[PDB]
């Protein structure tokens, strides 16, 4: 349970086998109320058939608890697995074709808002005297009319272009197999979604044959359909008391910067925080590259009016240290810290060093102090362990350096370790 042990044995010490190319045939379902940027509160129910065809449900909701369905998208098409990604090691690229996008509204208020918005976005879509009514499926992608209005909901299915299936087993055994389908991540800027080729992953979907059995959401979503959306349990929101230590549960993938694990320490006495960011080149986080240590201060919590269930925080980084973890990294840091700004840093593999030099010249152009506007939430897993979520990093590689760039979605959770 110690933070170091949990960072050495990610995901409860489970062993993963990745079959490349993956087998995606089956019914894949969400494990909870997912948050896409927006915010968009949703769950997924994806069927991939042996005919390389697909039926995907996207159930949307009005709240972070996924208890009041608003509208549901039924997406049909075909998928074609291509070659293994060279951008994201462990991922397989795929190509897809959409063949239909249907929408069903679940309340009369949503039926009215959506029909009006689609008509505003695509002036001719709707006939003169016929507003949408609830519980009726409506074609948003009318194919053979060459007229579509997926732009009204800023819809894109590019998540299907990056695919990874992990077979997870607790202990070195072939028992209690959980199959997880990772699909491409969703851009944090909804306008850029139709242009975004995924470079990381959404939260994993679980297989209907090989799912965690304590996952109540999984069963609710398995048995759902477009007319009976999954009603998730009305769990109460927990109050964020940023305290203790937290570590990554998985080897996380971030766009362009490769793979990583995190260790956070919060000091509720003086509202100070520390973070370790262990960077790796491999999708199993066994081949390290460099490590970053950050320390600073954080503000008090304010409940968000933009993301239900979120608590807004302001974080300030005052001090930062870097540890090279391979010869290439130490060499690069030595070449730049010396041949340009500064004189000597003697970067060494495994040796931590501050990036603010005594003369105040920071290496690689880092700007300290740095302020980030964060969003946090705390949940519990099926074993009751607390989980800490912070804001999804902006997809372009930018930092949430202004309040208007604060995330409306979250990263993969950290789990409490002390
Ligand atoms: C593919 O065959 C499956 C049965 O394996 C069927 O359910 C599905 O309708 C077919 N393709 C389409 C249109 O999704
Ligand atoms: C919009 O919808 C109304 C009501 O359904 C309909 O009368 C009208 O023709 C539509 N057209 C435009 C341009 O919005
Ligand atoms: C805050 O308190 C912690 C002890 O919990 C201590 O390690 C740290 O140095 C303190 N920071 C400041 C700025 O006082
Ligand atoms: Cl972070």
Residue numbers in the entry: 50 to 467
Tell me, in the authors' exact words, what the paper reports.
Adenomatosis polyposis coli down-regulated 1 (APCDD1)—a conserved single-span transmembrane protein containing a large extracellular domain—negatively regulates WNT signaling and plays important roles in hair follicle development, CNS vascular development, and glial differentiation. The APCDD1 ECD consists of two closely apposed β-barrel domains (ABD1 and ABD2).
To determine the three-dimensional structure of the ECD of mouse APCDD1 (referred to hereafter simply as “APCDD1”), we produced this domain as a glycosylated secreted protein using human embryonic kidney (HEK293) cells, crystallized it, and collected X-ray diffraction data to 1.95 Å and 2.15 Å resolution from two crystal forms. Fitting this model to the electron density map of eMBP-APCDD1 provided the starting point for iteratively solving the structure of the APCDD1 half of the fusion protein. ABD1 and ABD2 have, respectively, three and two intradomain disulfide bonds, a large area of interfacial contact, and one interdomain disulfide bond (Cys52–Cys466). This structure is observed in all three crystal forms (eight unique APCDD1 structures), with a global rmsd of 0.7 to 1.1 Å among structures. In particular, Gate-1 side chains show a concerted inward shift within the ABD1 pocket and, together with multiple other side chains in ABD1, largely occupy the interior of the superimposed ABD2 pocket. These distinguishing features of the ABD1 and ABD2 pockets are observed in all eight APCDD1 structures.
